[PDB]
Amino acid sequence: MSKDIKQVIEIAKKHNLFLKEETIQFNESGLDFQAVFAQDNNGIDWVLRLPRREDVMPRTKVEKQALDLVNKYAISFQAPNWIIYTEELIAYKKLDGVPAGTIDHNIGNYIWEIDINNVPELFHKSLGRVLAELHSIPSNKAAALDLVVHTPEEARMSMKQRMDAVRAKFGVGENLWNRWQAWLNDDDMWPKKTGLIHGDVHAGHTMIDKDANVTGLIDWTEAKVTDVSHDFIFNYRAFGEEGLEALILAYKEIGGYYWPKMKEHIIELNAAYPVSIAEFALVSGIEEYEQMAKEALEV
Ligand SMILES: CO[C@@H]1[C@@H](O[C@@H]2O[C@H](C)[C@@H](O[C@H]3C[C@@](C)(O)[C@@H](O)[C@H](C)O3)[C@H](N(C)C)[C@H]2O)[C@@H](CC=O)C[C@@H](C)[C@@H](O[C@H]2CC[C@H](N(C)C)[C@@H](C)O2)/C=C/C=C/C[C@@H](C)OC(=O)C[C@H]1O
Numbered sequence: 001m002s003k004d005i006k007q008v009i010e011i012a013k014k015h016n017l018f019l020k021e022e023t024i025q026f027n028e029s030g031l032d033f034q035a036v037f038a039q040d041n042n043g044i045d046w047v048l049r050l051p052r053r054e055d056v057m058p059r060t061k062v063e064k065q066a067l068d069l070v071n072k073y074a075i076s077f078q079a080p081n082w083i084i085y086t087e088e089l090i091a092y093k094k095l096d097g098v099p100a101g102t103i104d105h106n107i108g109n110y111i112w113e114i115d116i117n118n119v120p121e122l123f124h125k126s127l128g129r130v131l132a133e134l135h136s137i138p139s140n141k142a143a144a145l146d147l148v149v150h151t152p153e154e155a156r157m158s159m160k161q162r163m164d165a166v167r168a169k170f171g172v173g174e175n176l177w178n179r180w181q182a183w184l185n186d187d188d189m190w191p192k193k194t195g196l197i198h199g200d201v202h203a204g205h206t207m208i209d210k211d212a213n214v215t216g217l218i219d220w221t222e223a224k225v226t227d228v229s230h231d232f233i234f235n236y237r238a239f240g241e242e243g244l245e246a247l248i249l250a251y252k253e254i255g256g257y258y259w260p261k262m263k264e265h266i267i268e269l270n271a272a273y274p275v276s277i278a279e280f281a282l283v284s285g286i287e288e289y290e291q292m293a294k295e296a297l298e299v
């Protein structure tokens with residue numbers, strides 16, 4: 001249960017947004033924020049991002065820093081440009097296009113806007129464009145802000161540490177743990193460069209036009225300079241090896257950092273997705289996600 005119309009009106013009013021109530025539309029796809037789309041009495045349309053829990057707004061500090069960087073240096077895609085930003089409300093103008101898919105909590109999966117039964121080649125190609133562009137923003141510009149910046153070995157040690165931490169808290173199935181460790185311990189599989197990543201790339205953030213060309217990305221709380229591989233994970237989860245291959249190919253061809261074992265490395269990172277599920281469980285405190293994490297970790 002989240003905020004209702006009258007509550008949203010009051011939050012918006014406190015922030016000098018005076019909404020036309022009949023235009024208010026709720027979008028509940030986000031685990032961290034309630035989203036509202038609404039037009040104000042000035043005829044101006046808004047996205048209103050309303051935090052669901054105490055842990056949410058503290059994670060937006062880096063987000064704003066990352067958006068400043070991406071809005072300044074990105075040329076071929078849009079990102080939110082926040083107009084209002086307080087501990088109670090973030091607001092910005094809606095990006096062009098529509099999300100390639102959006103989570104429906106009644107089924108626990110996506111309602112797709114693209115033909116999931118035959119994904120357009122332009123979607124992989126253009127996501128490749130967007131990611132290579134993003135990942136090329138100079139790391140020194142991120143270091144001058146409070147963003148996390150990993151060298152390539154720091155990215156590896158960060159993964160080692162995060163795994164150790166989840167094992168200590170939850171346990172980890174022995175076979176899963178051995179798989180993780182064999183990946184960590186295989187020098188040849190790791191990237192030798194890092195870049196600025198989005199960190200939570202998925203269909204629900206990937207804005208597309210009528211041709212399934214990606215034109216924008218929302219939700220930048222996980223941006224940092226680290227292993228670029230994270231931004232390929234959803235393509236593997238949703239579209240399998242073939243979809244991962246298509247995205248890698250496009251990224252490589254347009255100038256993105258590539259190394260010989262990139263695909264295999266990404267697949268291992270996917271096998272380590274339970275680390276991320278566990279971390280969400282701990283950060284959010286949501287009991288169902290603790291259960292999910294234990295299942296995912298094969299405890
Ligand atoms: C986008 O990823 C998605 C993930 O959503 C992400 O889940 C990560 C673990 C979170 O990231 C983590 C790691 C971190 C390092 O980023 C950390 O800083 C951050 C705090 O948390 C991250 N957000 C918080 C950054 C969040 O968007 C889940 C949540 C946990 O997995 C979204 C829930 C609505 C889940 O729907 C649910 C309903 C409830 C249900 N179950 C519990 C009863 C469950 C199984 O599925 C829907 C699942 C759909 C599955 C279909 C496949 C194709 O879809 C994908 O693979 C994408 C998803 O996995």
Ligand SMILES: Nc1nc2c(ncn2[C@@H]2O[C@H](COP(=O)(O)OP(=O)(O)O)[C@@H](O)[C@H]2O)c(=O)[nH]1
Nearest residue numbers: 027029030031032033035047094095204218219
């Ligand atoms: N179409 C569209 N949807 C948006 C936009 N901004 C946010 N949303 C929706 O609002 C939801 C929640 O916003 P998000 O920043 O992802 O929140 P979080 O996932 O809870 O951290 C997203 O999943 C989208 O469905 C936008 O600019 N356009």
Ligand SMILES: [Mg+2]
Nearest residue numbers: 030204205219
């Ligand atoms: Mg989101």
Ligand SMILES: [Mg+2]
Nearest residue numbers: 032219220221
């Ligand atoms: Mg988020």
